[PDB]
Design a protein around this ligand. Structure first.
Ligand SMILES: *[C@@H]1O[C@H](CO)[C@@H](O[C@@H]2O[C@H](CO)[C@@H](O[C@@H]3O[C@H](CO)[C@@H](O)[C@H](O)[C@@H]3O)[C@H](O)[C@H]2NC(C)=O)[C@H](O)[C@H]1NC(C)=O
Ligand SMILES: *[C@@H]1O[C@H](CO)[C@@H](O[C@@H]2O[C@H](CO)[C@@H](O)[C@H](O)[C@H]2NC(C)=O)[C@H](O)[C@H]1NC(C)=O
Lengths: 110, 236
């Protein structure tokens, strides 16, 4: 019950799943560096003591959380496609969602 | 503001009065008890304040209204040839009251087709209608000809201070709009200045039918706009 089969087995399924499809490589490494930007901003708020604008922090933070959200919501539609939604309609909706999130996060940075 | 209309064959008067009572002001303020007892004692002889106004209108007037700034007033009585008015508060000495009246006459007795050309009209407008005992410190008479009218000649019996020709867009004025011919008279008396303003203009049938054809142009370009937005392929 040491769960040694879990991380190795899911490591084989996921790590085999990456290089079989070249676009999921783009999606999950871009998700990973979005997590690095969230960690860099969060340790900027920890390293100093104040969050002085506090709309700049939630601007630069909710653009990374929201963009990670939209990337997972596209990866789930490319790995196993939804019934009424094509793979090309899986991507234009991501574009429109990402442009709306970029507008609201450039309005919220002031 | 008057509004000539060839499609409805009607002329539509609307007047905005800003009247003061320049009589003597009343000491000890105003008390409704002394006013109401003064009504209940006898007969309402001749006194200072304003309770009713008698508006002398043209002969056949149809749709009477009397509004303030804040809403309409229901205390008005439009009998034949005479439009009686009760304001909300009685206008004592020095008090202000700004109101608006309006009515609707047919156009067949204010407008006359000329003889040389069929599409040339001559209008004679009553310069002043109001209560019988009023003095007018400023009058601006705006007559509004329809959208394709072109004014040739202008005559007034009373010497005005100013005159100008502009345009103003009313309902369904898709093009430039109504022709606002506005006079500015300074000092007038209700009883004395008996006059009519004479406008000679033209209004050809080329511009008479451009109103339903202009609204037809907007409906047509809206529906061809619907056609472009339904023959267009957007399917990713
Ligand atoms: C109803 O109509 C009356 C009559 O035109 C309006 O009264 C006028 O109001 C203006 C601005 O309130 C007055 O101008 C003022 O002049 C004095 C000096 O005379 C100056 O101290 C003020 O700063 C201002 O410029 C004007 O005198 C006054 N006319 C009369 C005869 O009293 C009234 O405003 C209108 N009310 C509404 C609600 O539309
Ligand atoms: C005579 O009437 C004309 C209207 O054409 C007045 O001119 C306008 O005056 C206003 C000031 O309230 C300006 O905003 C407009 O731009 C003017 N328009 C034009 C075309 O000049 C003029 O002031 C009036 N003159 C007098 C002496 O009453």
């Amino acid at each position: 019950t040491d769960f040694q089969e879990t991380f190795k087995t899911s490591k084989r399924a996921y790590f085999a799943q990456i290089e079989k499809y070249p676009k999921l490589k783009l999606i999950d490494t871009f998700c990973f560096f979005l997590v690095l930007l969230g960690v860099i901003q969060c340790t900027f708020i920890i390293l100093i003591r104040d969050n002085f604008p506090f709309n700049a922090f939630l601007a630069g933070f909710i653009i990374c959380v929201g963009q990670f959200v939209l990337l997972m919501s596209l990866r789930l539609q490319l790995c196993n496609s939804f019934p009424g939604i094509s793979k090309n309609r899986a991507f234009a909706e991501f574009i429109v969602a990402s442009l709306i999130l970029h507008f609201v996060c450039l309005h919220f940075i002031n | 503001d008057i509004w000539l209309s060839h499609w409805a064959s009607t002329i539509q008067f609307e007047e905005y009065y800003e009247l003061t009572n320049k009589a003597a002001k009343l000491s000890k303020g105003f008390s409704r008890l002394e006013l109401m007892k003064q009504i209940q004692t006898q007969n309402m002889r001749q006194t200072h304040f304003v309770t009713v106004l008698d508006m002398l209108l043209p002969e056949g007037a149809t749709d009477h209204y009397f509004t303030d700034l804040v809403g309409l007033v229901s205390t008005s009585h439009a009998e034949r040839d005479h439009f009686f008015i009760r304001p909300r508060f009685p206008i004592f000495g020095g008090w202000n009251y700004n109101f608006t009246v309006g009515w609707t006459n047919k156009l067949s007795d204010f407008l006359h087709v000329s003889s040389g050309s069929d599409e040339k009209f001559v209008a004679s407008i009553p310069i002043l209608n109001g209560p019988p005992d009023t003095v007018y410190d400023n009058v601006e008479l705006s007559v509004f000809l329809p959208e394709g009218a072109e004014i040739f000649d202008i005559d007034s019996p009373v010497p005005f201070t100013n005159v100008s020709i502009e345009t103003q867009k009313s309902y369904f004025d898709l093009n430039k709009g109504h022709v606002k011919l506005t006079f500015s008279y300074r000092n007038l008396i209700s009883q004395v200045a008996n006059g009519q303003v004479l406008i000679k203009y033209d209004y050809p049938k080329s511009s008479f039918f451009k109103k339903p054809l202009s609204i037809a142009c907007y409906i047509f370009t809206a529906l061809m706009g619907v056609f472009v937005l339904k023959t267009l392929n957007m399917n990713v």
